[PDB]
Each structure stands twice: as C-alpha cells, then as structure tokens.
Amino acid sequence: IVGGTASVRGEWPWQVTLHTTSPTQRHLCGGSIIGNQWILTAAHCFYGVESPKILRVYSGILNQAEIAEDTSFFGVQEIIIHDQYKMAESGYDIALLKLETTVNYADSQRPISLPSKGDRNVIYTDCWVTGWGYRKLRDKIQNTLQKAKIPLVTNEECQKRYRGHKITHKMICAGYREGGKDACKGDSGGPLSCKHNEVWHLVGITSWGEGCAQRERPGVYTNVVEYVDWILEKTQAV
Numbered sequence: 001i002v003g004g005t006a007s008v009r010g011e012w013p014w015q016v017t018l019h020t021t022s023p024t025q026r027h028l029c030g031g032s033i034i035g036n037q038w039i040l041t042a043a044h045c046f047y048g049v050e051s052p053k054i055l056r057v058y059s060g061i062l063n064q065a066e067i068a069e070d071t072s073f074f075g076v077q078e079i080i081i082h083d084q085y086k087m088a089e090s091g092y093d094i095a096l097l098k099l100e101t102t103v104n105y106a107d108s109q110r111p112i113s114l115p116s117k118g119d120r121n122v123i124y125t126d127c128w129v130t131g132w133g134y135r136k137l138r139d140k141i142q143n144t145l146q147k148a149k150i151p152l153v154t155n156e157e158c159q160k161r162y163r164g165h166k167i168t169h170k171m172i173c174a175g176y177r178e179g180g181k182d183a184c185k186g187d188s189g190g191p192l193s194c195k196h197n198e199v200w201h202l203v204g205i206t207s208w209g210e211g212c213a214q215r216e217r218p219g220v221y222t223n224v225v226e227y228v229d230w231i232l233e234k235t236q237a238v
C-alpha cells in the first residue's frame with residue numbers, strides 16, 4: 001500500500017495473508033474471509049501454482065512477524081478460478097480458496113459481507129484498501145498491515161485513464177487524480193472495503209494498475225457485486 005498508515009489490530013478481521021511455502025515460505029497475496037471455509041481472492045495469484053498443497057492461509061494477523069514455523073494456519077483444499085479468467089487486465093480476476101478446516105470466528109477473524117445487487121446505486125464515500133504490499137513500485141513486503149482511504153471513480157473516468165484497456169462494468173476503480181495513495185505489488189487479492197450505514201461490504205478485489213499511486217492512474221479492482229451469483233454457485237455443495 002502506497003501512502004497508507006499502520007492498521008489497528010482487529011480492524012480488518014476479514015483480511016488474510018495467503019502464503020506459499022515454495023521454495024521457502026513467503027507472503028503471496030491478500031484475500032478476504034467471506035464464509036467459514038471460504039477465502040475470496042484474485043485469480044492471478046495462482047500463476048504457476050500447481051497444487052493447493054503449497055498454500056497456507058493465515059487469519060488474525062497484523063504483523064508478518066507473528067507468522068513463525070509454530071504459527072497455526074488453514075490449509076487449502078481447493079483453488080477455484082473463474083473459468084473465463086485469462087489474465088488480470090482483461091477481467092474475471094476472481095478466485096475462491098476452499099479451506100481444509102473451518103474458521104472459528106472471533107473479533108480477530110470474521111467474514112465481510114458481500115455486496116447486494118441492490119447496492120449498485122449506493123454512493124460509497126468511505127472505501128479502504130489494505131495489505132502488506134510495497135509502499136512504492138520498487139520496494140518489498142511490509143511487516144505491518146497498511147490501510148489507505150481512497151475514493152471510487154466512475155468507470156467512464158477510469159476508462160479515460162486506461163485508453164489501451166477496456167474497463168468493463170465487471171471492474172471498479174479507485175484513486176485520487178493527483179495519485180499518492182494506491183495498492184501496489186503484494187496487495188493483490190486483498191479487499192477494497194467500503195463502509196455504508198455502519199456496515200462493511202466487500203466492494204472490490206485488488207487486481208491491477210499501471211504502476212502504483214501514479215497521477216491519473218486509478219487502481220483497478222474486480223467489481224465483486226458482478227460475481228455474487230458465481231460465488232453462490234461455486235460455494236454450493238456437491
């Protein structure tokens with residue numbers, strides 16, 4: 001996160017850090033608890049990942065320093081990537097992780113509500129992007145979970161800023177015209193969380209952008225409301 005500040009412990013209890021153990025253990029991506037056995041994240045996080053056996057999901061983490069060999073984690077039983085996904089910049093950048101065991105909810109770890117199709121008209125003015133990513137395009141993973149308040153922009157405005165791309169209605173953008181605050185490398189897969197009427201909703205999934213926090217280059221997020229039917233379909237038992 002560029003231009004952000006340290007989070008308070010427990011203030012983003014749906015935020016997880018997804019690790020890979022290969023070749024040695026490191027943070028791979030953010031993600032969001034959306035159900036007792038389900039993390040919502042970005043499809044691009046699994047580039048080159050051949051098996052869910054190398055993944056570990058840590059919840060209730062503020063500092064990466066909390067994670068040691070003796071720290072408990074959730075195994076991943078299944079990675080579910082949208083079947084239309086090709087790459088982050090052309091959309092469908094959404095994935096579900098089915099955990100091997102269930103999360104026991106507490107104030108350190110609990111789910112975020114998915115948006116309602118009826119909330120498509122709501123004007124959110126209290127949106128935050130969070131993660132352990134770079135503070136600048138050339139940087140490194142941060143110890144403490146960072147947060148930044150960023151305004152949503154219209155898809156028409158976002159499209160003007162990305163003329164070589166197609167910004168679809170299945171994407172949503174956020175950023176300041178002057179730049180300065182944004183997601184960056186290592187933040188992808190995490191939430192864009194918007195508070196409205198005292199309730200948090202998972203509005204976006206951190207997906208891509210041109211550089212980090214640049215002037216007139218909004219962050220691009222997966223527009224989660226467009227995938228509520230997909231999420232229901234994929235999280236249904238078989």
Ligand SMILES: Nc1ccc2c(CNC(=O)[C@H](Cc3ccccc3)NC(=O)c3ccc4[nH]c(=O)cc(O)c4c3)cccc2n1
Pocket residue numbers: 026027028029044045046047133140141182183184185186187188206207208209210211212213218219220
């Ligand atoms: N406004 C935005 C939003 C997202 C942006 C992204 C997202 N990509 C990303 O966040 C990419 C995604 C990725 C995942 C797996 C394989 C390849 C790429 N992630 C990373 O580049 C990434 C992830 C985990 C890491 N852990 C480490 O220990 C050290 C790293 O250097 C490291 C880098 C990148 C650049 C600008 C952005 N601007």
